[model samples]
Target: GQPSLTDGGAALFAWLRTMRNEHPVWRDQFGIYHVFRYDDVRQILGDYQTFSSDRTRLGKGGITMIDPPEHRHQRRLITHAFTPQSISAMEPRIRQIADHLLDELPGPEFDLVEHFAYPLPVIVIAELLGVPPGDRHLFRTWSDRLMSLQVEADPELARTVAAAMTEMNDYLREHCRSRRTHPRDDLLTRLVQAEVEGKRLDLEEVVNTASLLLLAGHLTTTVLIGNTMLCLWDHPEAEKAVRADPSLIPAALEESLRLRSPFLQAGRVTTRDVTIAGETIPANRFVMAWILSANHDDRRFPDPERFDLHRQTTGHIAFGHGVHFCLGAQLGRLEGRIALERLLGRFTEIHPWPREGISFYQSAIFGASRMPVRCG
Candidate 1:
């Protein structure tokens, strides 16, 4: 049987492998075709011309769902804000934000997701976008409501999400207007004023771009940090390895991403007929690249179930592929490294409180809904 949303990543991988052996690309009861193998998923992501990223299928706004030409242009305009130099310059600020949150830890026993994992990224994103210093609660509220749209399907929930989105849009539009009139030293201002070849982004485009960054810039990283903490707690040897060699922190992060990708699947609409794994998929149909399954494909990664920090984790699609590769990859890695370094350096040990009652958010996305930890 195929894995359902309730199945955790590990079990889901097992079932996905079983399904892959029989059919690499199979349409679900809802008529959505899902691709499991690493190569197949990679191809779909890499060939955006054939698999459109237009908002109709992939969702509205920001760059993630837009196709090329427009996507390329928007990405180029925004790329300057996320360069390695720029992100590196943010290290001191990132550490400061991390320190502030760490200093406020409620106690030795606390929910890591709420106390640490969630707030750190939210603060950093607020700083990055130059949100008013103390308005974090508002951004957090909107982000929370936005994420609900990912999993909520009922009519009532849909109506609620629509209202939240309207509020978010209105907020971003006003923020952009402020930047336009009284520019600030932040990404939002740069986005509003960024001009390439004498073409500047319109106010709507600026709001849309900021909206995308605001949502994605924080959420995925939050999951990455939370998942990494859980992974290290589960794999003591890997934890020991990282503790022994801080350099392994990056490798451990990659391994966690490979094993429990924050984003489990990506959607694409076929631009034309294409053949994958000897199966022909028609044009204009919805296709999903099951990245969680691909990262565990036996052909690409040996002993795919095992967590090995030393394993070669290059070419992983946790960030997607091609032009749509995460714009914040560098920043994400930096945040993960710093978070782990600070925590591991401070706490002699970190254990899940009660060692049970852990739970995960119910979505195609993989993440901990609640993971309490005792650190000392």
Candidate 2:
């Protein structure tokens, strides 16, 4: 299998094109069947019965790792608290948060990933989840490890991630207990009180849900912020247009998602012999629907490689599709939007540093690990 999401940027795009055209369904070295092309990815994502999300090997950690009917209850609990209204109302403060972070630039040459992209969403997620900004440091080590391939691919790392999840679970359990006795007006407090199917969430459920929220909430959104900026800077025309009209930040964010999808792919297990693109995948086999590749598919988006702000339609599944769509889509969108808007507002122009120093901390996710930029 290939390593580094954008390590061989052009080479990877060629493989994606080859996968979409030459062989739409090809098994990789890991025996996980890789599915490119937009239609196949969306179909596999939507038809969950044949492609189960609940892979017990992955520990059934959160709403994302579980199957439907069972998945519905957990989804409802999150939806109950994380309503569109709750997220939509957060736009104004997001601007302030972005501005506050932007004001603290280190020097003439600074790592945007460390000083800005990383902290902004960490602070935002902390605020949303009822954790003190000071206590935010405790969550990352666990979340970072858990987001890697260890939980499924590497045995040694998987055990380490297990330990991390256990530690996180304990921390969340204590928090849930505290909320039960004395509730607040944040996400944790609401989850403590969230009910579905005439049943209230138990301590385990609450802990797991909160754990997922903390894990999924911050990092991916963090990646999107940095990725969007990188995307705009990579295209001079896009950058110039965005600078001219700050209102295009939202569309610019979508363009980034389509071009450099932070979430590279979604892994699912086949429940039966599933035929896709003229090949049969055995039941229980793992399949990775390449969201990044699909976003780049010319069949869906004409001139799929371009960073067009007015890219005609916003149909990319970067946030995913169907029931398992990213619950943090609104939060991520708002953060990406405001983050870029504030950036364009603050800087007259941004010139990126040589990406040789650009680091990739997580294997599963792709974006800014150590994205450095020189902006004036």
Candidate 3:
């Protein structure tokens, strides 16, 4: 694909800003309206009636589609198990998993992306779903192929994703059926058994929910972990501080997320004619909210580019906003925090291998394709 993952092209931040100001709701040549400014975005995210996620043009859905009413209904049922307390309770288990994965590192040199960052989240997601640990590699292959939408300009990629998604859907569908008769302790089983009043999820709902979880659960966290390590390795002072005081690891993860939070944009569409900034966009046109730009907005942050552990981050839209806000946000944070804590605790220092090569995914979802590091 271009010599590297990030080489496809960086986000058009400057142009995006201009569009935000001069034509906030400006329609692009691609026939999509561009949304800018946090206020406008927050409104769109909050009011699902004005802007719905039910468009099949983008992709399939868990809760990413479905407008209010039904959207609220589905999400409410699934939210039972992932409460704040449940997520907190899972942290120790998360830490244990992180340790188990990191302990397998083969000495001073390894592909951090493959052995650690990528697999770590996959392992975690599998464990959460009660997917037998031994079947993880197959799941990874399918998930990786499906998310490789970045590289899927070719028809072949479409076939691969479609086929893998189908197989994965079948797997979940069957598993869900069994769980309906005999429930278990895992998320999939919980979903199968979950219901509100007389309403219960259909087969499609179960497949989509599990698929969304499988696809997103590991993918974003993989990038977060990899990018976090790279940032810490690049910032020696910050790295040392975290190592000297393990407590700083959480701060370090936040700074890393603030500095290079993955998923640059959240694409939304205009449901009605609306004015944003100075531009008016027609209904049903897609627009991308440049989260990376917003996170780095000079007006929003002082010395935005530099990663400062002590700086007060006003929070970020990395997990997105509104009803569409990442369902797995807490899980991601716990994963990232534990990844760096155990990794740095075990290895005194980490650096890129002498001839190391790295790449980022081109898909709207951004992150490393590979990260090779040497322990010292």
Candidate 4:
């Protein structure tokens, strides 16, 4: 964990490779078990019985943290809102958002995270939730605090985040209530009406789902766009290839996901005594499966250090695997593809600032943040 994630994740990949060889499943300093191997990570995620997804331990109550039955039920409620047709229908608007943001860029030199990558998905999510783009600053604050609480234990930050979360919940509840009286053509309205077995989601359930969508929807894609842009600039070979043939943009983004997954690990707790890679972990212990490490595992991808745009394989678990696979995967990919296409189309060349001028915004989960690019 010692400063291994700077410089487009080259250092981090090297450290994870070392850890994989040294101790693929070792307990970290905080006594939490960490799984590094590809197969072991996948198995832990797939076999939820051995490794439960119930995150009530962390005071988590949402679709991502819940186990089966309830998780499946809640997921079904919002699944239609993200269907292929639904997401595809939003492409024109997404493109316009991307184009408009690009037009307002500070100029030939700017921070993509601040000006572009950060705002694009938030705007999309704001629109989807029927929130105004101008109100994104408040959502951003709430989102940062909420996500920070998932990793930080500071007393002050906890209080602030808890209050913000409550405010967000209250706001969503009121929004859902209003939608009930005056329905609109938006995702929030859809969530308000989403039903199973002729039963609608309760007010709390609806609020939590909206909160989860707001939190999970934007941040990951923000890191993804920033990371993909950095990856392209970090490797000119891939950048040139992608620029030459726009079709290769998707492949490049996929490679970036594998090479430097924006989010690093997935959390689980062992339900019963389980053996992962011959190491027995007792029940009720926190476990973090390093998706970043697994993606870079030599056993899964040959020459894992190298970023190959045309790498043909479906083994990468960047979004994760099994039942908890990212619900927003398609939307994230769509945003990334469109963002990259538009940026490359508009700018003949994009370069990173000098190494000293660039610094990463550290997070407990994601590696890349605060990516600054010079457009020419």
lDDT of 1 by residue, 1-376 (tens): 2545443456677788887678899988987888999999999999989988883853466588786788898788887555578788889888888887888899899988888887777778778888887777888888787777443367887888888888988988899899989998888888888888887888988777766766676767878888887788778998888898888888889999998888888888998999999999998889989888888889889878788887864678999998898888888888888988887877887898866746777765588877788888
Error of 3 at 17 (Å): 6.5
Cα-based lDDT at residue 371, candidate 4 = 60
TM-score of each candidate? 0.94, 0.91, 0.89, 0.93
lDDT of 1 at 237: 92
Candidate 3 residues lying further than 4 Å off, grouped into runs, are: 1-26, 57-61, 149-152
Superior candidate under TM-score, 2 versus 4: 4
Clashing pairs in 2: none
Q: Candidate 3's C-alpha lDDT?
A: 0.72
Runs of candidate 1 with Cα error greater than 4 angstroms are: 4-8, 55-61, 150-152
- List runs of model 4 lying over 4 Å from the truth: 144-147, 150-152
Residue-by-residue lDDT tens digits, candidate 4, 320-356? 9878898888888999999989988999977777545
Candidate 4: which pairs clash? none
RMSD of 3: 3.0
Sorting all predicted structures by TM-score, with the top scorer first, yields 1, 4, 2, 3
Candidate 2, 45-74: lDDT as tens digits: 999899888766533656888777778777
RMSD of each: 2.0, 2.4, 3.0, 2.0
| lDDT values for all models | 0.81, 0.79, 0.72, 0.79
lDDT of 3 by residue, 1-376 (tens): 1123363223444454555456545456677665655566555666666666766655454678666776788888888655677667777878888888788888788888888887888778777877776777788788777776533367887788789888888877887788777888788887777778877777778778877777777777888888787777667898778788988888877777766767766666667877666567677777667676566555556665677889864776778777778899898999888888888878886778853387767665566778888887
